[PDB]
From a paper:
In this article, we studied five members of the PLL lectin family from [name] subsp. laumondii TT01 (PLL, PLL2, PLL3, [name], PLL5, collectively referred to as PLLs). All studied lectins belong to the seven-bladed β-propeller structural family. Each blade makes a W-motif composed of four antiparallel beta-strands (β1-β4) connected by β-turns and loops. The saccharide binding sites are located between the adjacent blades and are uniquely organized in two separate circles around the monomer.
The newly characterized lectins PLL, [name], and PLL5 were produced recombinantly in Escherichia coli and were purified by affinity chromatography. The PLL chain A blade W1 interacts with chain B blade W3, whereas in the case of PLL2, [name] and PLL5, chain A blade W1 interacts with chain B blade W5. The PLL is a tetramer in solution (sedimentation coefficient 7.6 S); [name] and PLL5 form dimers in solution (sedimentation coefficients: [name] = 4.9 S and PLL5 = 4.7 S). PLL preferred branched fucosylated saccharides (BLeY and ALeY); [name] and PLL5 preferred MGMR. [name] also recognized linear d-fucosylated trisaccharide (d-Fucβ1-2-d-Galβ1-4-d-GlcNAcβ), α-l-fucose, and lactose. The highest affinity was seen towards methyl-α-l-fucoside (αMeFuc), ranging from 0.4 ± 0.02 mM for PLL2 to 4.9 ± 0.08 mM for [name]. l-fucose was also significantly recognized. For PLL and [name], only hydrophobic site activity has been shown, as αMeFuc occupied only H sites, and structure in complex with other potential ligands is not available. However, conserved ligand binding residues in most P sites in PLL and [name] presume their activity.
Numbering used by the authors:
A (entry chain A), B (entry chain B): 31 to 351, 355 to 369
The structure:
């Protein structure tokens, strides 16, 4: 299945900032000039680098953005703001030999932690040694045999939990045994037969919920039946016909809403109705002609905004206001 | 002027939980049984103790609630959940000699920090030594000379910043010089002539904004004019005739909204219109007959919910749905 090709972050002064791989293999970025849904943008600025994955951005607990990418030497590289929303550090290597997009999250103690597929197809991770600070830990293996980019979320008890496509096409997960801990659970399978990266989110009632493209090209989901613990519900189809990984976000009223690339290469969405954890809507098309997975953020106004690579390789955007019309932010962007 | 008499926390499984002082001077709590605006409440459970302030509750970054109170001995006492949303430790003293409600915030490294007025009218503080865990640091003075209760917020660069009524009845502030620092700036005056505790919130564009009852009994506000920095706007009146401390929250679409006890002992509110930093609305009454400052929280549905001590000395609640009818949560509660 197709993968996400940008990340979006919310700056601490409330503006969205988008990171992509340019046609020159540099990381480029583009941001809203003002904190509002209909805001004009800066246009495209290079952060240089020579990269071969999607960039994954996270906001440090001191509000500096940090971007993680696979370099063309297959090491993990990072670049950070020197102060919130201000200038950038330049590229520093964190070593390793990686084969995926990095996935990033923040621990309860403010330390960033990065998960990758290694060249041995295990899940590997490493972390800041102190809140929002260098230096970083050594690389550590969590074993396994995976084929997806990993996805990571924090549980409602502070424990990170990672979801991957296994070599058997099942969904697998592994979690921290306590908040911030270097001791993880064994690998456990959630079964299923999947054909995308998984997407995970935390419901408002504190349960993780995971979304995948099944072998039948439908969207399927599975969720913790209690906060921060198994058992899981087991697999439920939301139907459709999709060709990307799904992406999921929480609306302002905490209904989940999922975005995919359809078989017709349009953007489609489906949502919980009425309230959080409510019964799901029909599938609805937002049109377009897209060649990536969609990426979704919530803006300062509380409205969802979606970013996609268009058939022309520009970055395009559409927002809750009916949704807005499609709007191009130009650029020449690539998939990895 | 009248103060807040409950504190409210958003638990990690999406339920509101209210703490108050009972007529027996113990701390009591009550919670939504499910994570919905529509939810029935548990009713009051005692946490015992013998207290002479409002309790202040905070959620540790590992999702365990923790409550801070002034004991009858004038010491700072705390009580914590042993697991998220599960059982309570019972009371432990952190010593000191305090004269105010405590105010608690979390640092960027996950360490709770508590701010009090000392017996010497100076601002004092102490902090967890590691993320979300005992032991605590020594008591330390940040000096100054203050009246009533402090208020604390985090800046959009992760620096804590505290606001107090000084003994000259101006608003004063003091901030960490760096995220998680123990080095604070000097005291600075923002002038004014106030007769309540201040309330502080962070706007969606990253600027702190403070609300106070002025000596004229109007609601006044002042804001950082840039993210995380002076100079401030200087004081502007939002008029009205109020007899409590104000409380403020952000709506789903990030319009700030302020709640007060009016001179007619009704609950009144006023909000930013159209968007975050659109012009303020007219004052509007939500009726009721109340004898405290209101306390506001956002529920899992993205809806504001307000708690007040009624004339019957029960706790009452009213919520965004046109607001709901008033609903009694019963109990027998007191101010200190
Ligand atoms: C630190 O170890 C190096 O990088 C890891 C991310 C793995 O790819 C491993 O095979 C390799 O030897
Ligand atoms: C449990 O069902 C299995 O896993 C799901 C994720 C889907 O791929 C379905 O077609 C497959 O048979
Ligand atoms: C505006 O610049 C265009 O888009 C960027 C994202 C890069 O692909 C660059 O090479 C290209 O010319
Ligand atoms: C606009 O109304 C004024 O302010 C409100 C907050 C109330 O105190 C009311 O009695 C007073 O007249
Ligand atoms: Cl299987
Ligand atoms: Cl003592
Ligand atoms: Mg299986
Ligand atoms: Mg003593």
């Amino acid at each position: 299945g197709l993968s996400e090709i940008v990340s979006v972050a919310n700056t601490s002064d409330g503006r969205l900032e988008v990171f992509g791989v340019g046609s020159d293999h540099a990381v480029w970025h583009n941001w809203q000039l003002t904190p509002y849904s209909n805001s004009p943008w800066s246009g495209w600025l290079s952060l240089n680098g020579n990269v071969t994955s999607k960039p994954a951005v996270y906001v440090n607990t001191d509000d500096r953005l940090e971007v993680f990418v696979r370099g063309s030497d297959n090491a993990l590289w990072h670049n950070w703001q020197i102060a919130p929303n201000l200038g950038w550090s330049g590229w520093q290597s964190l070593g390793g030999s990686i084969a995926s997009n990095p996935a990033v999250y923040v621990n309860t103690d403010g330390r960033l932690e990065v998960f990758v597929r290694g060249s041995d197809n295990a899940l590997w991770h490493l972390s800041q040694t102190a809140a929002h600070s260098n230096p970083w830990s050594s690389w550590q293996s969590l074993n396994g045999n995976i084929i997806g980019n990993p996805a990571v979320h924090i549980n409602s008890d502070g424990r990170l939990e990672v979801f991957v496509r296994g070599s058997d096409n099942a969904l697998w997960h592994i979690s921290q045994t306590a908040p911030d801990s270097n001791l993880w659970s064994n690998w456990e399978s959630l079964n299923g037969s999947i054909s995308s990266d998984p997407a995970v989110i935390g419901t408002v009632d504190g349960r993780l919920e995971v979304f995948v493209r099944g072998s039948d090209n439908a969207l399927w989901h599975n969720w913790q039946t209690v906060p921060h613990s198994g058992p899981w519900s087991g697999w439920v189809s939301l139907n459709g016909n999709i060709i990307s990984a799904p992406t999921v976000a929480r609306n302002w009223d905490n209904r989940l809403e999922v975005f995919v690339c359809g078989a017709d290469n349009a953007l489609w969405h489906i949502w919980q109705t009425v309230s959080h954890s409510g019964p799901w809507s029909s599938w609805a098309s937002l049109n377009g002609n897209i060649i990536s997975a969609p990426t979704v953020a919530q803006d300062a106004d509380g409205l969802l905004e979606v970013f996609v690579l268009g058939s022309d390789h520009a970055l395009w955007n559409i927002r809750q206001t009916s949704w807005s019309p499609w709007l191009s932010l130009n650029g020449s962007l690539i998939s990895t």
